[PDB]
Amino acid sequence: AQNPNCNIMIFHPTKEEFNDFDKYIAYMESQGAHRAGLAKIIPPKEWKARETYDNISEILIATPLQQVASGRAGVFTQYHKKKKAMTVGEYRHLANSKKYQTPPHQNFEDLERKYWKNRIYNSPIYGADISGSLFDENTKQWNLGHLGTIQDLLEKECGVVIEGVNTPYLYFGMWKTTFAWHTEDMDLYSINYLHLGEPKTWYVVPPEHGQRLERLARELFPGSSRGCGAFLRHKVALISPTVLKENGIPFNRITQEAGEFMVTFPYGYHAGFNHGFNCAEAINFATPRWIDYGKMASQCSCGEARVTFSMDAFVRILQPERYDLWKRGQD
Numbered sequence: 001a002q003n004p005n006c007n008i009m010i011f012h013p014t015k016e017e018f019n020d021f022d023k024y025i026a027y028m029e030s031q032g033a034h035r036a037g038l039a040k041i042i043p044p045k046e047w048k049a050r051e052t053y054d055n056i057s058e059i060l061i062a063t064p065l066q067q068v069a070s071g072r073a074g075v076f077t078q079y080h081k082k083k084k085a086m087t088v089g090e091y092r093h094l095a096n097s098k099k100y101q102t103p104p105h106q107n108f109e110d111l112e113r114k115y116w117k118n119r120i121y122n123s124p125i126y127g128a129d130i131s132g133s134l135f136d137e138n139t140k141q142w143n144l145g146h147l148g149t150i151q152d153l154l155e156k157e158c159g160v161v162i163e164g165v166n167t168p169y170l171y172f173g174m175w176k177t178t179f180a181w182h183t184e185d186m187d188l189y190s191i192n193y194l195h196l197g198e199p200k201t202w203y204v205v206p207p208e209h210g211q212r213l214e215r216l217a218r219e220l221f222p223g224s225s226r227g228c229g230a231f232l233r234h235k236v237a238l239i240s241p242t243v244l245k246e247n248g249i250p251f252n253r254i255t256q257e258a259g260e261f262m263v264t265f266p267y268g269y270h271a272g273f274n275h276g277f278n279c280a281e282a283i284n285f286a287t288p289r290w291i292d293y294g295k296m297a298s299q300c301s302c303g304e305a306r307v308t309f310s311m312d313a314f315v316r317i318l319q320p321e322r323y324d325l326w327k328r329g330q331d
């Protein structure tokens with residue numbers, strides 16, 4: 001069995017290997033990359049996502065989210081308070097302000113210490129989940145707006161034609177902006193490209209050990225657990241590496257820098273934080289190996305998780321028994 005310790009693997013494809021996206025994912029899995037839940041892909045040196053980032057400041061963040069924490073430093077939830085719209089140029093200036101900017105630090109490990117010590121005492125503002133793309137249309141390789149769609153994969157594997165679309169999302173971050181512990185909708189893959197700015201630190205639990213994280217989360221968030229049998233789908237809970245180590249949960253960590261891709265694999269729980277002003281693009285995707293994960297994915301039916309139009313068909317076709325209850329949660 002390849003990668004039996006479930007370490008995060010880092011890949012350096014050549015420009016030739018960068019042509020066929022599906023083939024490269026399948027290659028990485030042949031080497032055991034999925035066992036970690038997360039992999040890093042460094043694009044070939046010849047590749048670029050677009051020519052420059054000089055003209056992005058007029059993109060609108062219609063609903064910036066202030067991430068307000070509750071709990072203790074290593075075990076907390078966050079809620080998202082909606083703020084007034086602002087442009088990317090306005091948000092960059094805010095991220096760089098004395099109130100929100102990255103503190104002085106020695107290295108990524110020092111910054112990680114400072115994040116876990118201090119995150120809860122601040123409420124950073126995240127421009128998340130903005131439909132759109134920063135890939136130039138002429139970028140033919142690993143262009144996250146030109147991937148094969150999940151609907152077409154389901155149709156190719158299973159023969160059923162379904163409605164829905166699959167488009168990318170932009171994330172504009174600042175110091176301390178936080179992504180809570182989650183797997184993807186329907187336990188899909190994700191791919192994330194850091195277009196510019198400061199790094200993003202990731203934490204990940206191997207898919208084979210995801211239920212260990214779930215059982216800890218039910219212990220640590222006991223009211224949330226009573227409210228919903230899949231409350232990590234709400235995407236609000238944080239647990240620090242120190243707490244994970246104290247409770248024996250297997251995980252790994254890695255820092256993504258500008259110009260690098262990360263892939264999350266089906267049922268790979270992940271969480272993380274931004275080091276400073278940055279912009280990432282991400283999208284979900286599927287492969288043949290996902291289908292079985294999709295059929296077994298948990299679902300929130302309490303009403304909190306509320307998701308896209310296109311998840312309807314995935315539930316309806318892969319999980320017909322759950323469909324009725326889940327749809328009640330969506331309505």
Ligand SMILES: O=C(O)CNC(=O)C(=O)O
Pocket residue numbers: 171178179190191192200264270280282283
């Ligand atoms: O970058 C972020 O805030 C969150 N991204 C992801 O969870 C992802 O790409 O799967």
Ligand SMILES: [Mg+2]
Pocket residue numbers: 055056057058059
């Ligand atoms: Mg612009």
Ligand code: NI
Pocket residue numbers: 182183184190264270
């Ligand atoms: Ni994710």
Ligand SMILES: [Zn+2]
Pocket residue numbers: 227228229230231233234300301302303304305
């Ligand atoms: Zn729920």
